[PDB]
Amino acid sequence: SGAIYVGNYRVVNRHLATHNDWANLVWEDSSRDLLVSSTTAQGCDTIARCDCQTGVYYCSSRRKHYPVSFSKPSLIFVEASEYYPARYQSHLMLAVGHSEPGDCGGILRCQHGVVGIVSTGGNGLVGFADVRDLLWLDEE
Ligand SMILES: CC(=O)Nc1ccccc1CC(=O)N1CCC[C@H](C(N)=O)C1
Numbered sequence: 637s638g639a640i641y642v643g644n645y646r647v648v649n650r651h652l653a654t655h656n657d658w659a660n661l662v663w664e665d666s667s668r669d670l671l672v673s674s675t676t677a678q679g680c681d682t683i684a685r686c687d688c689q690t691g692v693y694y695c696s697s698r699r700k701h702y703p704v705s706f707s708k709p710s711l712i713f714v715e716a717s718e719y720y721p722a723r724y725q726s727h728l729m730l731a732v733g734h735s736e737p738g739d740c741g742g743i744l745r746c747q748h749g750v751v752g753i754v755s756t757g758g759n760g761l762v763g764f765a766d767v768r769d770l771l772w773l774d775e776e
């Protein structure tokens with residue numbers, strides 16, 4: 637589990653969105669596994685606007701933050717899960733790291749801010765949904 641809290645937005649994995657998220661929806665994209673809802677309180681996270689390919693992510697199944705090298709956002713085939721069939725997910729970045737399904741929502745960050753959230757996982761792989769292109773998260 638986990639979310640990004642920037643401005644008056646809450647960014648979560650679409651497959652983990654709650655009823656309150658759907659009832660206060662701002663934007664969602666199944667191809668990216670992302671959903672954004674509105675919040676009453678202002679958040680403290682800032683979004684990275686950069687081209688970093690190194691950063692650190694939070695792994696809830698180890699209670700640890702790990703430094704990782706990650707690929708550029710791309711269209712990757714992901715195997716079936718209980719939330720989606722086997723399909724192509726867009727704006728996904730892969731790294732070598734520990735991951736389990738409940739680790740979705742953990743933040744990937746660099747020196748500039750938040751880069752994305754854990755969305756997928758393989759044997760010794762972790763995939764992150766990028767948010768750096770979502771410029772509108774910084775306003776309204
Ligand atoms: C075996 C493993 O590492 N599982 C793992 C770890 C961490 C997170 C997720 C998984 C499995 C996974 O990739 N998916 C299940 C949840 C929805 C994902 C999606 N965005 O399409 C696909």
Ligand SMILES: [Zn+2]
Binds near residue numbers: 686687688
């Ligand atoms: Zn950066």
